[PDB]
């Protein structure tokens, strides 16, 4: 089998992407944030504290003839941005772009943090990291990809995120029309439960490539590109007036600037992030100070190849017995 679904930016800055997901019988369609940096499929629901729901579409398990309470199971997750959610668990039928899994754990939120409530466009998350990170207790549950894998034509999914435009998540096949040149594959460590890999270096604008190992995660659920302070300083030094602002919480730059590109290495191959991808607009409405899309990972504890990086590539998440990651230009 295969599946193919369009993923759509939630706003004009590409802060996140939503993908429609069918849950239950008859189908209830929710718009979920596909997140390769976590491993829980959780949704706003009829069980979510009413004051914490503000415009989201909810899953109502009592209206699904295929929903079953997973007795005694609870979940609770905290994300890198400080947000969180928790609740209980149903199994139900879940379909993405024509690909159907029966008996998928659907984690129903009883509580969500303010960031989730305040974002009316995201109805929940669909985790695509390794199932070892799944938070369901006392019996850990599998991700949608893990459940689908054996049925897929090939045990892969691909992320093709757009810049200020829709893109695509495919399951079970590689669309050879969706990228240019060749796909370069690179080793993955699953030791921390992430799609963790080592970039071979970077360049800023038309500058020379610096060969240096940068370990980090391919994370579709993180907006920005988080890299070591040395690398980030080298980037922003090429932008007149850019500075790190403790009050704002990162590097800012004059909105009048033209940003240089940023290149990262994948083996001997190179992925170029155009300068415009690195502009996250005014820090507050009407400001001429703009927020940068490349930020320091110092104090996160891990480097993160988030959407800013991933959207410059066609990315293969290869879930073979020994997983790997592939990157192509597009």
UniProtKB/Swiss-Prot annotation:
Positions of disulphide bridges: 255-290
GO MF term set: aspartic-type endopeptidase activity
Oxidoreductase in keyword set: no
Catalytic site: 35, 199
Top-level EC class as recorded in UniProt: hydrolase
Known catalytic reactions: Hydrolysis of proteins with specificity similar to that of pepsin A, prefers hydrophobic residues at P1 and P1', but does not cleave 14-Ala-|-Leu-15 in the B chain of insulin or Z-Glu-Tyr. Clots milk
Keyword set, alphabetical order: Aspartyl protease, Disulfide bond, Hydrolase, Protease, Signal, Zymogen
EC number: 3.4.23.22
Limits of the Peptidase A1 domain: 17-328
Any one GO BP annotation for this protein: proteolysis
Similarity annotation: Belongs to the peptidase A1 family.
Protein name: Endothiapepsin
Organism: Cryphonectria parasitica (Chestnut blight fungus)
Region of the whole protein represented: 90 to 419 of 419
């Amino acid at each position: 089998s295969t599946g193919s679904a369009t993923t759509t930016p939630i706003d004009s800055l590409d802060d996140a992407y939503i993908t429609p997901v069918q849950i239950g019988t008859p189908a209830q369609t929710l718009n979920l944030d596909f997140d390769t940096g976590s491993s829980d499929l959780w949704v706003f629901s009829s069980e979510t504290t009413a004051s914490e729901v503000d415009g989201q579409t909810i899953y109502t398990p009592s209206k699904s003839t295929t929903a079953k309470l997973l007795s005694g199971a609870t979940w609770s997750i905290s994300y890198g941005d400080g947000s969180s959610s928790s609740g209980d668990v149903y199994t139900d039928t879940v379909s993405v772009g024509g690909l159907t899994v029966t008996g998928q754990a659907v984690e129903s939120a009883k509580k969500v943090s303010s960031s989730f409530t305040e974002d009316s466009t995201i109805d929940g998350l669909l985790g695509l990291a390794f199932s070892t990170l799944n938070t369901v207790s006392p019996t850990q549950q599998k991700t949608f990809f893990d459940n689908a894998k054996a049925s897929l034509d090939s045990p892969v999914f691909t992320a093709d995120l757009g810049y200020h435009a829709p893109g695509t998540y495919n399951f079970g096949f590689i669309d050879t029309t969706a990228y240019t040149g060749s796909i370069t594959y690179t080793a993955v460590s699953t030791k921390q439960g992430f799609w963790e890999w080592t970039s071979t270096g970077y360049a800023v604008g038309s500058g020379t490539f610096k060969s240096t190992s940068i370990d980090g995660i391919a994370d579709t659920g993180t907006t920005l590109l988080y890299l070591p302070a040395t690398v980030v300083s080298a980037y922003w030094a090429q932008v007149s007036g850019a500075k790190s602002s403790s009050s704002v919480g990162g590097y800012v730059f004059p909105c009048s600037a033209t940003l240089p590109s940023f290149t990262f290495g994948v083996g001997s191959a190179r992925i170029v992030i155009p300068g415009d991808y690195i502009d996250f607009g005014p820090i507050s409405t009407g400001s001429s100070s703009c927020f940068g899309g490349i930020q320091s990972s110092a104090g996160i504890g891990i480097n993160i190849f988030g959407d800013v990086a991933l959207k410059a590539a066609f990315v293969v998440f290869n879930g073979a017995t020994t997983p790997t990651l592939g990157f192509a230009s597009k």
